[PDB]
Amino acid sequence: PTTENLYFQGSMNIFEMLRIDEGLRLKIYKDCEGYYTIGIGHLLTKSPDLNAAKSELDKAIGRNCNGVITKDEAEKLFNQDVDAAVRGILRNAKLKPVYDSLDAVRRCAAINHVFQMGVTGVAGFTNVLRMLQQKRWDEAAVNLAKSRWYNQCPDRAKRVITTFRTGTWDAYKNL
Ligand SMILES: C=CCc1ccccc1O
């Protein structure tokens, strides 16, 4: 590692991580499963009706957006969604002990997973939870690679799986 490469971990954090996996879009779009999304991975609704999505949008931003937001508004919604995922882990009796056992980088991958799937989705991975607590990283990653979450949209999930395997930021290098 060069002096610069050793600096790369101090530049990575949950916000930079999710920003890479989710992208940044200032107009309403459909994500890889066809669900209306905006900003940095903010799922607006699962309904096929673009009208619900715009209404959810104006609600979340608090103005008449007509489907378009600013970078600063994107950042704000994103920070709220990150806070919600972390809070969702910490209050949950099953996820909190596993999260507490993890190192800082794998904790970021855990918050990313919850941001993407939701609390009950993640807490259903009974086996992967036990694997992670037992530091069985290879097995946890192979089992996450069996999931619909990863297989229906691999490019959004692949870096998170690699990060559970390694506990480093290497999958976020060299975009
Ligand atoms: C079970 C998969 C990973 C994971 C671990 C701990 C907390 C949340 C989370 O998504």
Side-chain angles (χ1 to χ4, degrees), residues 89 95 98-99 102 110 113-114 122 125 128-129 132 144 164:
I89 286 167
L95 301 180
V98 181
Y99 180 83
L102 293 172
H113 195 204
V114 171
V122 173
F125 283 101
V128 172
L129 286 164
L132 290 175
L144 283 170
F164 276 121

Side-chain angles (χ1 to χ4, degrees), residues 11-26 28-45 48 50-53 55-58 60-75 77-98:
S11 71
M12 287 302 306
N13 62 35
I14 179 63
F15 305 106
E16 301 297 340
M17 189 196 204
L18 272 165
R19 168 63 179 81
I20 289 159
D21 288 321
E22 295 292 352
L24 166 68
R25 299 285 290 277
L26 294 188
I28 292 176
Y29 71 102
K30 295 182 148 173
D31 78 2
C32 50
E33 303 196 297
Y35 309 144
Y36 290 122
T37 306
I38 206 167
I40 303 162
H42 184 87
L43 176 71
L44 281 166
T45 183
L50 181 74
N51 298 275
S55 179
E56 304 278 354
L57 187 54
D58 296 348
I61 305 301
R63 62 181 185 78
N64 187 345
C65 303
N66 204 2
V68 179
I69 56 169
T70 66
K71 283 190 243 317
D72 293 343
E73 278 160 342
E75 187 69 23
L77 182 56
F78 179 47
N79 298 335
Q80 290 176 349
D81 289 340
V82 170
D83 187 61
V86 171
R87 286 185 290 96
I89 286 167
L90 293 174
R91 68 188 168 212
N92 182 282
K94 197 112 171 221
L95 301 180
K96 185 175 182 296
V98 181

